[PDB]
């Protein structure tokens, strides 16, 4: 249980850098 | 039942002499005369029943016997024991300084 | 004296900048 | 034609015993008179195959066979030894010296690493009665002493030995110590170990002699921590002999 | 358009100042070579090695041959004193030619001669100076092979009986030794370059790069950059600068490796033994104590179950075990004799280890390459009482540090030259920022 | 040693190799006196 | 604490009799021990062959004894095996083998002593230290 | 419009989400092939002989190892500096047991991080900026060579490499200590002064420009809703900033240049770094930290101990102890 | 291995506590505009 653990949460942390990569708020000049 | 063989062999007469069958060589070191030569001599002819055996080893000048008359007093045998004789442990047991 | 000696040495290089200095020089 | 050390090394034939040539069919007879010894014993193992745990009543275990993990270090060999003329015709060879065990690692189905110390340590190997000649059928037969994969002084990962560390689990400071007897408690195991070594190969010219082996021991105990495993070796062997 | 401290890219388009820099600067690093070789000199003392001593410069002169005898004995001193003398007296000619040219010569040279002259820009007149270059360094690489060939011959580490001076009459030119070399790999047991292990291949290396460097002189004076090198670099001082930069870095790592793995071309005997030869010395050291005292020491089983003093390598070969298990690829003068096919010959061990070998062993032991920045010697918890660090550590780590440095001296000048090419060194452009006139990523 | 006809310059001997480091030094004097130009 | 004539006082034979050091002795005795000897014996003990130290007590059960001055230049001269049986200055540094241990050359009679007294005086100063190796740095 | 022209143009192109460019494609695949092996091993390799003394470390999850004591493990110390690809093992039980993963992982990363710091060259080219972001990157990346590479080089062998790992990251440099006392080197000194100052200097910046926000914004909204992305006024008031500092100092020890600040931003830490870089990659020739051991004696020639035997003692701790059975002679010699 | 076994309900609150909260504040900013 403790190794499923660990990486359910690495796996989330990688899914997260997808959404914040290419789901980002775009930068808008003014 | 489980016992720490070396540690019992320290309640032996290994534990307060040089042990013929079982004494690591740097022992040797600790009387005079005995040191390179006899102290090979011994190590190789092991073991001994007596104490006195170590005098018929092959090939002794008498002034040979004669350090080892001196020095039979500091000598003991007991029986082997494997953890202290196999590895070479007699001629280099990983002690240094 | 080996601080003697690169004392000699050591006082060359401002020397040669004090002199071109004081002659107003290509400095 | 020989090879240099430059012309082996890296190549894995140093790990490699010499071979005999298929035409080397003859006989080296034995003159009771003179004495022998073995100048060069080579043991090249070429598998490894423990015994499983059959769980069941009388099943009984097979030998199921096993990848070798620690690559070309597995041979023995510069072995040497009296060979002995007995009153019977025998001959006895006795293991005086050389590279006389490698620790070995092979892994069984399953991700079991298995260690055993290969060995043929103070190896007495005898053959039949009146030989006065070693052919092409000579068969020796012996055993060896097996002793402990580690020795005295090596220490486990939490700083237990025998000749050295700590004599308990020191990070339990108040646990019971009853049920780490088995792991707190190291000892040296020595057992005997079997072989049997069949000429095939003999060159009545030069001494030589080759073969085939099979021997059986135990594998590591880890000081008595766990039960060993049984292990049988084949592979080809290789020697030389000299008129003493 | 530069500040103090930017102070040199003054010089980028004043060629008769920029020689005078360059011109001066060698006077420096000869000045250096010839005080440096008469202050080891002057310390110099020949009953102690000289790898107790301090010496980097007397053992590359020793290493050519000059001033030693059998073993690497320090015979005459004199080729010494006159190696650093005439280096020495030579930077004056450089000093006074660098301080002309950089204050009082022509400042600029293309309008006093279309020869010495130069643009930067002009593709042939800068493959001509390379060309002439080349052609010189090819001739120094044949001033070794004369050396080796003619003129008295170099230091044979490997020389049976001890090391000697020796001629080298047969230099390999075997094409597939000398390129073998750059082909194998840089990995162990391999070592690319560095595992060069005898002088015949190492003179006849230099008469193929001295070939090689005349053919390629010679071909860039007599071409132009053909189409394809003419779009794939900067044409600048800077970029030229950085390219160089890059070249020196990489020469600089790999003369680092040289001199803590070769024993050959640095000499043991003069630079004190590699990391792997002090380490496989220990192991010789006790195993040959241990037999002396009646230890099999084939038959020893360590307390892992590997052998104490002796086991197989990954590949069968009979080594020194121990953590020096590591270094079994080491090979040297005073341990080949104990080498049989299959590494380690266990008769030979028992019979033929000679006292000369146990002397080199414990020397060599006693004088592995650790030591402190105060000179300490030995492991990081000795105490004072030694005064001691090998030049092989001084050697190797001062070189990495400059080999470092000249990759990022390349980084910053590649990069600077590239934008100076396209015109945005200094910035961008605000009414002209590229950015801004591209679609947005999202 | 140095051979003893040269033996008076052994201090000399063991400053000239200094002597590079000071050229680095006499180009911070120049540029103080120029005034960092 | 000083250096006081009673802790340069040594040994000087097996008869019993003593010689005191000059302090600049033991000063130029450390010297010339580092210079020919601290590469293999730093500290009092012997890194190529541990089991043989230079503390007084090992000296003095070595064949001819060795916890004098007499013992130890002698030693330096015609070293041998703790138990005297055979000669090795083959492998030991020694006059006697000056020829392949060439920091032995320039060693006079009286730098032997010096070396030897400070062998002597050294564990007088330190005690345990000498010879005891890392357990004790 | 050839097939060649075409994809090189979307090599290079600064259109893409992610820029590719020439680095990238070396970047891109060796980076990939490093993170599937170390994702799975992590996870589930079996345990690795990194002193080759056929004593096998546990460093995955799920041999009975959390997130911190886990480690991508060394290869064997019987390797040395061999190159030990998959294809030169018998079978992968074999590669796996001699620790082969580690090297696949660390030779594919070094080159991806090269061709990492070469990528933000080539950005910075079509996007007309100056070029030195990668030389601040070198001073990290050096210091992963010295680590992974260099000090394997020095030593002899893979097996003294960092592991990839927390804990065994701890191991490495408690070891590192006792062979080399690298607290005594003045390289490591600076690196200190590097990250030390690096963190202080990243805090005074960042609570002098905060400090002098020009108020844009009502007490009920973020401050940060006052700058909108490429304005081009300055949203803090440097001359206020200076101000405070240069009276909490002295007038002279204040930028009121912004492009020399932040130039002392981007020096001073890389160059601590490089230093410590440094220092790890010379200290693989074993070029170790001041020894003042027994540097102190009194008029007899007693000791007397100064903080550096202190050091000295737990440094002998730490040598008797590590790697307790790998050595059979009395120098660790490397 | 013998771990604790409310270590898992201790992890499993500790993701799920904090992230909903986000998830919350974020949502209904979203449906603001
Ligand atoms: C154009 C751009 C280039 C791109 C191409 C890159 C492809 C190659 C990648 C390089 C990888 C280097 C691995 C070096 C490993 C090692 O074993 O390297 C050492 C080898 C030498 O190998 C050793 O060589 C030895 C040779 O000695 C032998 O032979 C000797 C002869 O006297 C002696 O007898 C000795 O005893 C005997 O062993 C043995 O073979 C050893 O087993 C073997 O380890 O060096 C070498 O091949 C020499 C080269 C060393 C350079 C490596 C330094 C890397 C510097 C990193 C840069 C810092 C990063 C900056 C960031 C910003
Ligand atoms: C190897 C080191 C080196 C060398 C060779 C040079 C060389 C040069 N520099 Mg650079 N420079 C250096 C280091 C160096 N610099 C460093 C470290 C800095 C930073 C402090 C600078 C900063 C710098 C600036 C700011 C400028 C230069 C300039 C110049 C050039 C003109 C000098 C001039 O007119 O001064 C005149 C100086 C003098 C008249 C003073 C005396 C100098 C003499 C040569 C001393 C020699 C002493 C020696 C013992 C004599 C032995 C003689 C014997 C052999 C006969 C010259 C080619 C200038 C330039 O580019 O012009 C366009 C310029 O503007 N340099
Ligand atoms: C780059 C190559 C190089 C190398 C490897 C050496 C190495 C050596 N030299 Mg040499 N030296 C060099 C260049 C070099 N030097 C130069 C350019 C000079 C002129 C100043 C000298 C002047 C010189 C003298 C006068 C002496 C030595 C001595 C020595 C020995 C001891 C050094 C020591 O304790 O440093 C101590 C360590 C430092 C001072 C560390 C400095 C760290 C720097 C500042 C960081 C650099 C960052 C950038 C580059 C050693 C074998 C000594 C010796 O034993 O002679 C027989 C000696 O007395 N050298
Ligand atoms: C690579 C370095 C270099 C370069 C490119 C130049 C280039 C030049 N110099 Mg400078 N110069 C140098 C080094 C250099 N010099 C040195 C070392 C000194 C001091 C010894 C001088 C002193 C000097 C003066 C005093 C003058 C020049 C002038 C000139 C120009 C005319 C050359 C001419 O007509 O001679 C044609 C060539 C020769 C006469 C050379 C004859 C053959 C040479 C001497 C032998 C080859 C040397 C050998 C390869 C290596 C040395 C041996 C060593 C290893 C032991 C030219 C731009 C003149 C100038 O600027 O005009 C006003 C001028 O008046 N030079
Ligand atoms: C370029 C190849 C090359 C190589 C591999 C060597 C190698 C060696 N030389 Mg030789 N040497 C060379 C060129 C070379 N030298 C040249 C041109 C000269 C004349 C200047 C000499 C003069 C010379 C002398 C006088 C002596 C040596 C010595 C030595 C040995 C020890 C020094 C050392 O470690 O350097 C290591 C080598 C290097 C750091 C050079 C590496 C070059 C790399 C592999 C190639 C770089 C290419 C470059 C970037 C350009 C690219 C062009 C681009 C368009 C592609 C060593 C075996 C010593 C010796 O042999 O003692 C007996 C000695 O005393 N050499
Ligand atoms: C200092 C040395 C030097 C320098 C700086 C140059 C510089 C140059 N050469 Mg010249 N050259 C030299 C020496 C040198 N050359 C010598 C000695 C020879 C004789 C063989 C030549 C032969 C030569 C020819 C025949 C040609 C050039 C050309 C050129 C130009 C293009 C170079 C180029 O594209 O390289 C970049 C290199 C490449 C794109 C491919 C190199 C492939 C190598 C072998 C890969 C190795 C990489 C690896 C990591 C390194 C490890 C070593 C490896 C071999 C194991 C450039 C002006 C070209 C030109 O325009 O001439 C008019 C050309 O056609 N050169
Ligand atoms: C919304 C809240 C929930 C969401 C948050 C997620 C849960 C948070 C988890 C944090 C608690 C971690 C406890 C793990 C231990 C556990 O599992 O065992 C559970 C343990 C109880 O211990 C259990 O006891 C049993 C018999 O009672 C047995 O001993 C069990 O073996 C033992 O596990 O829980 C506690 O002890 C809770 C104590 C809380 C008090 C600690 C506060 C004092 C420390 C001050 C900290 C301030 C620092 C602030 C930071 C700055
Ligand atoms: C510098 C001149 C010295 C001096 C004064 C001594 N040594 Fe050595 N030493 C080394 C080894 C291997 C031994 C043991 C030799 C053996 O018995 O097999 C010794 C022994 C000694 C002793 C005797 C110690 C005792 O208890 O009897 C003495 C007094 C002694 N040495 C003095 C090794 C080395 C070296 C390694 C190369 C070198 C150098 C020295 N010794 C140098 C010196
Ligand atoms: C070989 C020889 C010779 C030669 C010599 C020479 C070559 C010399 C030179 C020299 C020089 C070349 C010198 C120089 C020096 C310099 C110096 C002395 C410097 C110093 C500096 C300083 C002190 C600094 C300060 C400062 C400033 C100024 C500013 C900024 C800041 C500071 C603080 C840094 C002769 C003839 C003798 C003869 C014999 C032999
Ligand atoms: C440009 C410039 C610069 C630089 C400069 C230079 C770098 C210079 C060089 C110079 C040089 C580089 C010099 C040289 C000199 C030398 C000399 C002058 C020598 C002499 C010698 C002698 C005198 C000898 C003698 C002897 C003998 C013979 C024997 C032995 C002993 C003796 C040593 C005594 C600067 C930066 C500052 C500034 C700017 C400009
Ligand atoms: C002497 C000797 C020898 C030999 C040597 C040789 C013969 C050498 C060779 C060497 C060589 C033969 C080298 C080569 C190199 C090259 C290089 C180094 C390259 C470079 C490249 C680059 C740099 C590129 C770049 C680029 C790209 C890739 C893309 C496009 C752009 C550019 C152009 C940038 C020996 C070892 C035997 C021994 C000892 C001595
Ligand atoms: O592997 Mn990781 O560690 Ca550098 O020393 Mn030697 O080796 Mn081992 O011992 Mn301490
Ligand atoms: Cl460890
Ligand atoms: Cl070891």
Same mark, same amino acid.
């Given at each position: 249980m403790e190794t499923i653990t660990y990486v359910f949460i690495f796996a989330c942390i990688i899914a997260l850098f997808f959404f914040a990569i290419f789901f980002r708020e775009p930068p808008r000049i003014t | 039942e489980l016992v720490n063989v070396v540690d019992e062999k320290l309640g032996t007469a290994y534990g307060e002499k040089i042990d013929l069958n079982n004494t690591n060589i740097a022992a040797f070191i600790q009387y005079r005369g005995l040191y390179p030569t006899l102290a090979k001599l011994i190590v190789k002819?092991? *073991?001994?029943?007596?104490?006195?055996?170590?005098?018929?080893? *092959?090939?002794?000048?008498?002034?040979?016997?004669?350090?080892?008359?001196?020095?039979?007093?500091?000598?003991?045998?007991?029986?082997?024991?494997?953890?202290?004789?196999?590895?070479?442990?007699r001629y280099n047991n990983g002690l240094y300084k | 004296a080996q601080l003697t000696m690169i004392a000699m040495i050591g006082i060359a290089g401002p020397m040669i900048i004090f002199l071109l200095a004081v002659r107003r020089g290509n400095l | 034609q020989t090879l240099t050390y430059d012309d082996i090394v890296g190549t894995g034939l140093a790990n490699k015993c010499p071979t005999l040539d298929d035409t080397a069919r003859g006989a080296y007879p034995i003159d009771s008179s003179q004495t022998y010894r073995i100048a060069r014993l080579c043991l090249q193992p070429t598998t490894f195959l423990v015994k499983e745990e059959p769980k069941n009543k009388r099943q009984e275990a097979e030998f199921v066979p096993t990848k070798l993990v620690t690559r070309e270090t597995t041979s023995l060999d510069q072995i040497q030894g009296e060979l002995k003329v007995n009153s019977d015709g025998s001959l006895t060879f006795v293991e005086e010296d050389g590279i006389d065990f490698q620790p070995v690692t092979v892994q069984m189905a399953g991700g079991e690493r298995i260690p055993l110390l290969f060995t043929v340590k103070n190896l007495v190997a005898s053959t039949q009665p009146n030989v006065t000649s070693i052919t092409t059928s000579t068969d020796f037969k012996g055993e060896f002493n097996v002793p402990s994969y580690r020795t005295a002084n090596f220490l486990d990962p939490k700083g237990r030995g025998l000749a050295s560390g700590y004599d308990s689990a020191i990070a339990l400071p108040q646990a019971k110590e009853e049920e780490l007897a088995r792991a707190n408690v190291k000892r040296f195991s020595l057992t005997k170990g079997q072989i049997s070594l069949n000429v095939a190969k003999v060159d009545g010219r030069t001494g030589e002699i080759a073969g085939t082996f099979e021997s059986e021991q135990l594998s590591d105990d880890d000081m008595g921590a766990h039960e060993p495993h049984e292990v049988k070796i084949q592979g080809v062997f290789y020697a030389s002999i000299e008129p003493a | 358009g530069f500040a103090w401290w930017a102070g040199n890219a003054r010089l980028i388009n004043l060629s008769g100042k920029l020689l005078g820099a360059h011109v001066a600067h060698a006077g420096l690093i000869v000045f250096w070579?010839?005080?440096?070789?008469?202050?080891?000199?002057?310390?110099?003392? =020949?009953?102690?090695?000289?790898?107790?001593?301090?010496?980097?410069?007397?053992?590359?002169?020793?290493?050519?041959?000059?001033?030693?005898?059998?073993?690497?004995?320090?015979?005459?001193?004199?080729?010494?004193?006159?190696?650093?003398?005439?280096?020495?007296?030579?930077?004056?000619?450089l000093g006074f030619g660098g301080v002309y040219h950089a204050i009082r010569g022509p400042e600029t040279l293309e309008e006093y001669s279309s020869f010495f002259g130069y643009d930067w820009k002009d593709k042939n007149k800068?493959?001509?100076?390379?060309?002439?270059?080349?052609?010189?360094? &090819?001739?120094?690489?044949?001033?070794?092979?004369?050396?080796?060939?003619?003129?008295?011959?170099?230091?044979?580490?490997?020389?049976?009986?001890? &090391?000697?001076?020796?001629?080298?009459?047969?230099?390999?030119?075997? =094409?597939?030794?000398?390129?073998?070399?750059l082909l194998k790999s840089p990995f162990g047991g391999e070592g690319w370059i560095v595992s060069v292990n005898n002088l015949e291949d190492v003179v006849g290396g230099h008469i193929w790069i001295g070939l090689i460097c005349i053919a390629g002189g010679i071909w860039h004076i007599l071409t132009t950059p053909f189409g394809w090198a003419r779009r794939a670099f900067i044409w600048s001082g800077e970029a030229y600068l950085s390219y160089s930069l890059g070249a020196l870095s990489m020469m600089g790592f790999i003369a680092t490796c040289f001199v803590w793995f070769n024993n050959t071309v640095y000499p043991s005997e003069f630079y004190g033994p590699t990391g792997p030869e002090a380490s496989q010395a220990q192991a010789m050291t006790f195993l040959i104590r241990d037999q002396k005292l009646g230890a099999n020491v084939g038959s020893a089983q360590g307390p892992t179950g590997l052998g104490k003093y002796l086991m197989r390598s990954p590949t069968g070969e009979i080594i020194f075990g121990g953590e020096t298990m590591r270094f079994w690829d080491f090979r040297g003068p005073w341990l080949e004799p104990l080498?049989?096919?299959?590494?380690?010959?266990?008769?030979?061990?028992?019979?033929?280890?000679?006292?000369?070998?146990?002397?080199?062993?414990?020397?060599?032991?006693t004088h592995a390459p650790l030591g402190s920045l105060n000179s300490v010697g030995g492991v990081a918890t000795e105490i004072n009482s030694v005064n001691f660090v090998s030049p092989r550590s001084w050697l190797a780590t001062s070189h990495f540090v400059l080999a470092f440095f000249f990759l990022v001296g390349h980084l910053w000048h590649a990069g600077r030259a590239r934008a100076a090419a396209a015109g945005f060194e200094k910035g961008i452009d605000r009414e002209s920022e590229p950015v801004l006139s591209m679609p947005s990523l999202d | 040693k140095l051979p003893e006809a040269y033996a008076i310059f052994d201090p000399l001997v063991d400053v000239l190799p200094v002597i590079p480091v000071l050229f680095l030094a006499l180009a911070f004097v120049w540029q103080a006196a120029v005034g960092f130009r | 604490a000083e250096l006081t004539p009673e802790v340069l006082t040594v040994p000087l034979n097996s008869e019993g009799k003593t010689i005191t050091l000059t302090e600049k002795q033991y000063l130029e005795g450390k010297r010339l021990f580092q210079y020919a000897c601290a590469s293999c014996h730093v500290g009092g003990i012997t890194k190529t062959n541990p089991s043989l130290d230079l503390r007084t007590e090992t000296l003095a059960l070595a064949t001819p004894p060795r916890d004098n001055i007499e013992g130890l230049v002698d030693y330096m001269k015609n070293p041998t095996t703790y138990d005297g049986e055979q000669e090795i200055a083959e492998v030991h540094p020694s006059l006697r083998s000056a020829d392949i241990f060439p920091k032995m050359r320039n060693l006079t009679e009286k730098d032997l002593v010096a070396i030897a007294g400070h062998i002597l005086v050294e564990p007088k100063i330190l005690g345990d230290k000498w010879g005891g190796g890392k357990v004790y740095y | 419009a050839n097939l060649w022209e075409r994809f090189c143009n979307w090599v290079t192109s600064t259109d893409n989400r992610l820029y590719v460019g020439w680095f990238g494609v070396i970047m891109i695949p060796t980076l990939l092939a490093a993170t599937i092996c170390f994702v799975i091993a992590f996870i589930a390799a079996p345990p690795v002989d990194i002193d080759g003394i056929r004593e096998p470390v546990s460093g995955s999850l799920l041999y009975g190892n959390n997130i911190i004591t886990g480690a991508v493990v060394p290869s064997s110390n019987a390797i040395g500096l061999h190159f030990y690809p998959i294809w030169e093992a018998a079978s992968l039980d074999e590669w796996l047991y001699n620790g082969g993963p580690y090297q696949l992982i660390i030779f594919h990363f070094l080159l991806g991080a090269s061709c990492y710091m070469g990528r933000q060259w080539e950005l910075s080219?079509?996007?007309?900026?100056?070029?030195?972001?990668?030389?601040?990157?070198?001073?990290?990346?050096?210091?992963?060579?010295?680590?992974?590479? +260099?000090?394997?080089?020095?030593?002899?062998?893979?097996?003294?490499?960092?592991?990839?790992?927390?804990?065994?990251?701890?191991?490495?440099?408690?070891?590192?200590?006792?062979?080399?006392?690298?607290?005594?080197?003045?390289?490591?000194?600076?690196?200190?002064?590097?990250?030390?100052?690096?963190?202080?200097?990243?805090?005074?910046?960042?609570?002098?420009?905060?400090?002098?926000?020009?108020?844009?914004?009502?007490?009920?909204?973020?401050?940060?809703?006052?700058?909108?992305?490429?304005?081009?006024?300055?949203?803090?008031?440097?001359?206020?900033?200076?101000?405070?500092?240069?009276?909490? +100092?002295?007038?002279?020890?204040?930028? !009121?240049?912004?492009?020399?600040?932040?130039?002392?931003?981007?020096?001073?830490?890389?160059?601590?770094?490089?230093?410590?870089?440094?220092?790890?990659?010379?200290?693989?020739? !074993?070029?170790?930290?001041? !020894?003042?051991?027994?540097?102190?004696?009194?008029?007899?020639?007693?000791?007397?101990?100064?903080?550096?035997?202190? +050091? !000295?003692?737990?440094?002998?701790?730490?040598?008797?102890?590590?790697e307790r059975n790998a050595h059979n002679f009395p120098l660790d010699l490397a | 291995m013998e771990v604790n076994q409310l270590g898992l309900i201790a992890t499993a609150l500790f993701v799920l506590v904090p992230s909903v909260f986000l998830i919350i504040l974020y949502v209904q900013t979203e449906s603001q505009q």
């Amino acid at each position: 249980m403790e190794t499923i653990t660990y990486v359910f949460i690495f796996a989330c942390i990688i899914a997260l850098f997808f959404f914040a990569i290419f789901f980002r708020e775009p930068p808008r000049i003014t | 039942e489980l016992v720490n063989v070396v540690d019992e062999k320290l309640g032996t007469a290994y534990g307060e002499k040089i042990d013929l069958n079982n004494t690591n060589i740097a022992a040797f070191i600790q009387y005079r005369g005995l040191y390179p030569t006899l102290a090979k001599l011994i190590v190789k002819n092991a *073991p001994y029943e007596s104490v006195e055996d170590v005098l018929n080893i *092959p090939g002794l000048t008498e002034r040979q016997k004669q350090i080892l008359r001196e020095n039979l007093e500091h000598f003991t045998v007991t029986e082997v024991e494997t953890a202290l004789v196999e590895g070479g442990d007699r001629y280099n047991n990983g002690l240094y300084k | 004296a080996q601080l003697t000696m690169i004392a000699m040495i050591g006082i060359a290089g401002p020397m040669i900048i004090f002199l071109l200095a004081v002659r107003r020089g290509n400095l | 034609q020989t090879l240099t050390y430059d012309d082996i090394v890296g190549t894995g034939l140093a790990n490699k015993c010499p071979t005999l040539d298929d035409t080397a069919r003859g006989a080296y007879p034995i003159d009771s008179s003179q004495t022998y010894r073995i100048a060069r014993l080579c043991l090249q193992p070429t598998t490894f195959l423990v015994k499983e745990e059959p769980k069941n009543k009388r099943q009984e275990a097979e030998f199921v066979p096993t990848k070798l993990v620690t690559r070309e270090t597995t041979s023995l060999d510069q072995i040497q030894g009296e060979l002995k003329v007995n009153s019977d015709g025998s001959l006895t060879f006795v293991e005086e010296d050389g590279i006389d065990f490698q620790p070995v690692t092979v892994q069984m189905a399953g991700g079991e690493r298995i260690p055993l110390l290969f060995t043929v340590k103070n190896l007495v190997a005898s053959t039949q009665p009146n030989v006065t000649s070693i052919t092409t059928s000579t068969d020796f037969k012996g055993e060896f002493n097996v002793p402990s994969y580690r020795t005295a002084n090596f220490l486990d990962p939490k700083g237990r030995g025998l000749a050295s560390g700590y004599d308990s689990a020191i990070a339990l400071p108040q646990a019971k110590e009853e049920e780490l007897a088995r792991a707190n408690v190291k000892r040296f195991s020595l057992t005997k170990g079997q072989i049997s070594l069949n000429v095939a190969k003999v060159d009545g010219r030069t001494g030589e002699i080759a073969g085939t082996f099979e021997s059986e021991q135990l594998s590591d105990d880890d000081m008595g921590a766990h039960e060993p495993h049984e292990v049988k070796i084949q592979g080809v062997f290789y020697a030389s002999i000299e008129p003493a | 358009g530069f500040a103090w401290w930017a102070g040199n890219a003054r010089l980028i388009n004043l060629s008769g100042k920029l020689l005078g820099a360059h011109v001066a600067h060698a006077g420096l690093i000869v000045f250096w070579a010839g005080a440096m070789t008469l202050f080891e000199l002057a310390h110099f003392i =020949p009953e102690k090695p000289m790898y107790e001593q301090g010496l980097i410069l007397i053992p590359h002169i020793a290493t050519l041959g000059w001033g030693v005898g059998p073993g690497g004995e320090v015979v005459d001193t004199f080729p010494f004193f006159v190696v650093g003398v005439v280096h020495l007296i030579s930077s004056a000619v450089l000093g006074f030619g660098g301080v002309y040219h950089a204050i009082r010569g022509p400042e600029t040279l293309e309008e006093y001669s279309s020869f010495f002259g130069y643009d930067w820009k002009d593709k042939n007149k800068m493959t001509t100076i390379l060309g002439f270059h080349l052609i010189v360094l &090819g001739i120094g690489a044949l001033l070794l092979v004369a050396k080796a060939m003619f003129f008295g011959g170099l230091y044979d580490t490997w020389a049976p009986g001890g &090391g000697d001076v020796r001629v080298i009459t047969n230099p390999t030119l075997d =094409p597939r030794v000398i390129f073998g070399y750059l082909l194998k790999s840089p990995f162990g047991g391999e070592g690319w370059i560095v595992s060069v292990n005898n002088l015949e291949d190492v003179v006849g290396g230099h008469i193929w790069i001295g070939l090689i460097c005349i053919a390629g002189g010679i071909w860039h004076i007599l071409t132009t950059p053909f189409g394809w090198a003419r779009r794939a670099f900067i044409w600048s001082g800077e970029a030229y600068l950085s390219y160089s930069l890059g070249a020196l870095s990489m020469m600089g790592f790999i003369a680092t490796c040289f001199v803590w793995f070769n024993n050959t071309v640095y000499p043991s005997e003069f630079y004190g033994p590699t990391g792997p030869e002090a380490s496989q010395a220990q192991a010789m050291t006790f195993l040959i104590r241990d037999q002396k005292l009646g230890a099999n020491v084939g038959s020893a089983q360590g307390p892992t179950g590997l052998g104490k003093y002796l086991m197989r390598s990954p590949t069968g070969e009979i080594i020194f075990g121990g953590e020096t298990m590591r270094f079994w690829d080491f090979r040297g003068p005073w341990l080949e004799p104990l080498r049989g096919p299959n590494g380690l010959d266990l008769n030979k061990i028992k019979n033929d280890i000679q006292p000369w070998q146990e002397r080199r062993a414990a020397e060599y032991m006693t004088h592995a390459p650790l030591g402190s920045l105060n000179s300490v010697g030995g492991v990081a918890t000795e105490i004072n009482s030694v005064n001691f660090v090998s030049p092989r550590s001084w050697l190797a780590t001062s070189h990495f540090v400059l080999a470092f440095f000249f990759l990022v001296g390349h980084l910053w000048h590649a990069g600077r030259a590239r934008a100076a090419a396209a015109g945005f060194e200094k910035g961008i452009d605000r009414e002209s920022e590229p950015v801004l006139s591209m679609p947005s990523l999202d | 040693k140095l051979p003893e006809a040269y033996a008076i310059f052994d201090p000399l001997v063991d400053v000239l190799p200094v002597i590079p480091v000071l050229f680095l030094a006499l180009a911070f004097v120049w540029q103080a006196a120029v005034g960092f130009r | 604490a000083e250096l006081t004539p009673e802790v340069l006082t040594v040994p000087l034979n097996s008869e019993g009799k003593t010689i005191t050091l000059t302090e600049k002795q033991y000063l130029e005795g450390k010297r010339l021990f580092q210079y020919a000897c601290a590469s293999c014996h730093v500290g009092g003990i012997t890194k190529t062959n541990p089991s043989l130290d230079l503390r007084t007590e090992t000296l003095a059960l070595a064949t001819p004894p060795r916890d004098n001055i007499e013992g130890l230049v002698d030693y330096m001269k015609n070293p041998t095996t703790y138990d005297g049986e055979q000669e090795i200055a083959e492998v030991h540094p020694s006059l006697r083998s000056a020829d392949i241990f060439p920091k032995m050359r320039n060693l006079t009679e009286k730098d032997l002593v010096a070396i030897a007294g400070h062998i002597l005086v050294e564990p007088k100063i330190l005690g345990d230290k000498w010879g005891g190796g890392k357990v004790y740095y | 419009a050839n097939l060649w022209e075409r994809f090189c143009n979307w090599v290079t192109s600064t259109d893409n989400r992610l820029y590719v460019g020439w680095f990238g494609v070396i970047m891109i695949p060796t980076l990939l092939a490093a993170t599937i092996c170390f994702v799975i091993a992590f996870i589930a390799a079996p345990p690795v002989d990194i002193d080759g003394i056929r004593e096998p470390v546990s460093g995955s999850l799920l041999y009975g190892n959390n997130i911190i004591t886990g480690a991508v493990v060394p290869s064997s110390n019987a390797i040395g500096l061999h190159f030990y690809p998959i294809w030169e093992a018998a079978s992968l039980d074999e590669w796996l047991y001699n620790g082969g993963p580690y090297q696949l992982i660390i030779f594919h990363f070094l080159l991806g991080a090269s061709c990492y710091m070469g990528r933000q060259w080539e950005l910075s080219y079509r996007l007309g900026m100056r070029p030195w972001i990668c030389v601040a990157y070198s001073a990290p990346l050096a210091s992963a060579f010295a680590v992974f590479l +260099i000090y394997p080089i020095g030593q002899g062998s893979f097996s003294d490499g960092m592991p990839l790992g927390i804990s065994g990251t701890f191991n490495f440099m408690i070891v590192f200590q006792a062979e080399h006392n690298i607290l005594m080197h003045p390289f490591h000194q600076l690196g200190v002064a590097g990250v030390f100052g690096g963190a202080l200097f990243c805090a005074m910046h960042g609570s002098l420009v905060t400090s002098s926000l020009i108020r844009e914004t009502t007490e009920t909204e973020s401050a940060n809703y006052g700058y909108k992305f490429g304005q081009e006024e300055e949203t803090y008031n440097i001359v206020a900033a200076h101000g405070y500092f240069g009276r909490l +100092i002295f007038q002279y020890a204040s930028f !009121n240049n912004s492009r020399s600040l932040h130039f002392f931003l981007a020096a001073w830490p890389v160059v601590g770094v490089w230093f410590t870089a440094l220092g790890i990659s010379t200290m693989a020739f !074993n070029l170790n930290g001041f !020894n003042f051991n027994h540097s102190v004696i009194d008029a007899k020639g007693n000791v007397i101990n100064t903080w550096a035997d202190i +050091i !000295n003692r737990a440094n002998l701790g730490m040598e008797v102890m590590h790697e307790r059975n790998a050595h059979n002679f009395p120098l660790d010699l490397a | 291995m013998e771990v604790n076994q409310l270590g898992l309900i201790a992890t499993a609150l500790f993701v799920l506590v904090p992230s909903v909260f986000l998830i919350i504040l974020y949502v209904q900013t979203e449906s603001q505009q």
